[PDB]
Amino acid sequence: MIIKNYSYARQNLKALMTKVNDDSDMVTVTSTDDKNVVIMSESDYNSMMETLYLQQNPNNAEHLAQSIADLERGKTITKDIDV
């Protein structure tokens, strides 16, 4: 998580784009107009949107948490599947 200003971020835009994708970092870009932005990788953006999608309904959030717990516990069903 990185805090920089506009006039720095306008110059080395590509250097900040590679730094948020490989170090999994974030950049807040500050303006004098009190209109700040946050830059993240598209991978991290799609992950949070997909996570919010899966957790958006409480029955589904519960279903995922019970299932992940069952897999960690070994309360589970293992079968050969004709694919």
Binding site: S47, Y53, L54, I68
Partner: protein
């Protein structure tokens, strides 16, 4: 072709439901499973995505626009948390 798959109890019940009532769902799920086994958790069809928060370590692929295959790969063994959205 045969893959050895570990299911959560609710994911297995939903897969069995799809086998009886929606064979087009099973075929797409099976396609995603073949792609995970050949390419790993993050490569291939279904827009594979890392998940966050309490789902960290798990991945999602799209079965259709609603249902996600939520899964993890543990030493090339595929474990299925979910293959159906629960509303």
């Amino acid at each position: 072709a045969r893959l050895n798959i570990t299911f959560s109890p609710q994911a297995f019940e939903d897969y069995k439901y799809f086998q009886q009532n929606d064979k087009k769902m099973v075929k797409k799920i099976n396609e995603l499973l073949k792609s995970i086994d050949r390419n790993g958790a993050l490569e291939g069809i279904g827009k594979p995505e890392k998940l966050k928060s309490n789902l960290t370590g798990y991945y999602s692929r799209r079965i259709n626009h609603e249902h996600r295959l939520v899964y993890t790969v543990d030493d090339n063994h595929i474990k299925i948390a979910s293959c159906k959205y629960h509303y």
